[PDB]
């Protein structure tokens, strides 16, 4: 189904966007982006989870 294919293609794009950091070293500032990137991926995870779940049950 057209919609589902489009939805998955989009979720993939959301993971492609906001990818791993740099990497760059700086005291406590290196671990600062870990917090940032974890938060962002934890979010994408649940969004994708929800988006897909609507195309099933």
């Amino acid at each position, epitope marked *: 189904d057209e919609d589902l294919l489009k*939805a998955v293609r989009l979720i993939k794009f959301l993971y492609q966007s906001n990818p791993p950091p740099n990497p760059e070293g700086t005291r406590q500032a290196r671990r600062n982006r870990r917090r940032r990137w974890r938060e962002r991926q934890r979010q994408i995870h649940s*969004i994708s989870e929800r*988006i897909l779940s609507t195309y099933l049950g």
Partner: antibody
Framework: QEQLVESGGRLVTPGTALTLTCKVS????????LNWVRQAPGKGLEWVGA??????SEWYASWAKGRFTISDTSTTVTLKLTSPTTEDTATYFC????????????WGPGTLVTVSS | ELVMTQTPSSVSEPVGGTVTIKCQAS??????LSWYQQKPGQPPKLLIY???NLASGVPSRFMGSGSGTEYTLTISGVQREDAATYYC????????????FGGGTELEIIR
């Protein structure tokens, strides 16, 4: 600092295609959701569709599909009314989702489309 | 194909008085819900996003909640300003049922 302004709202004859424009400006964020919402004279809000910015991910509503075309660009988002009818008279809005949690944080002031003979 | 069932159509209430607007979801919608106030000839303003949290600026008297398919906006100690139409927005644009609007509830302040 973010902002949205719509233009292109004008009186048109029926079937005579119009194109609406939304001037996206000040968004630190790369790609996001940009939705089109209409509101006819003294009526409720109706979501028309949306687009994910960084891609070409067009999403329309049950009624809108076909007669509508959302087009993302550098600067900026458009809405084409392929075959307008009198029932399309409304003020169209563009609204951004700066969080990607299906909610319109920033709105445009609107632009009035008028479909009449 | 997702539908929002906003109740009531209109509502009158004095200052101090409390208001309750209800939205009835036609499908799932997790925190896939937001509440908006719209004063005449003005673009809507977000009050409550992700069903229960208030946008910045929005005063404490604005309360959001929901239980699976029932969502409630609760303006507690209503003030003169709050006089406006109110909409709820449910879903995500990314289908399968897209995102849909409440359909309004006009609030008349009583003096």
């Amino acid at each position: 600092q973010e902002q949205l302004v719509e233009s292109g709202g004008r009186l048109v004859t029926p079937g005579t295609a119009l194109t609406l424009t939304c001037k996206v400006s000040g968004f630190s964020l790369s790609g996001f959701w940009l939705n089109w919402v209409r509101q006819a004279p003294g009526k409720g809000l109706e979501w028309v569709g949306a687009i994910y910015r960084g891609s070409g991910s067009e999403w329309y509503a049950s009624w809108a599909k076909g007669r509508f075309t959302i087009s993302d660009t550098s600067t900026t988002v458009t809405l084409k009314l392929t075959s307008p009818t009198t029932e399309d008279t409304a003020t169209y809005f563009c609204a951004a989702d700066t969080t990607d949690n299906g909610y319109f944080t920033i709105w445009g002031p609107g632009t009035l489309v008028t479909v009449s003979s | 194909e997702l539908v929002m069932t906003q109740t009531p159509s209109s509502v009158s209430e004095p200052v101090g008085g409390t208001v309750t607007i209800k939205c009835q979801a036609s499908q799932s919608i997790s925190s896939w819900l937001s509440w908006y106030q719209q004063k005449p000839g003005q673009p809507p303003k977000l009050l409550i996003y992700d069903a229960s949290n208030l946008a910045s600026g929005v005063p404490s008297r604005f309360m959001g909640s929901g239980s699976g398919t029932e969502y409630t906006l609760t303006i507690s100690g209503v003030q003169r300003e709050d006089a406006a139409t109110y909409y709820c927005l449910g879903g995500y644009p990314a289908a399968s049922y897209r995102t849909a609007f409440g359909g309004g509830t006009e609030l008349e302040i009583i003096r």
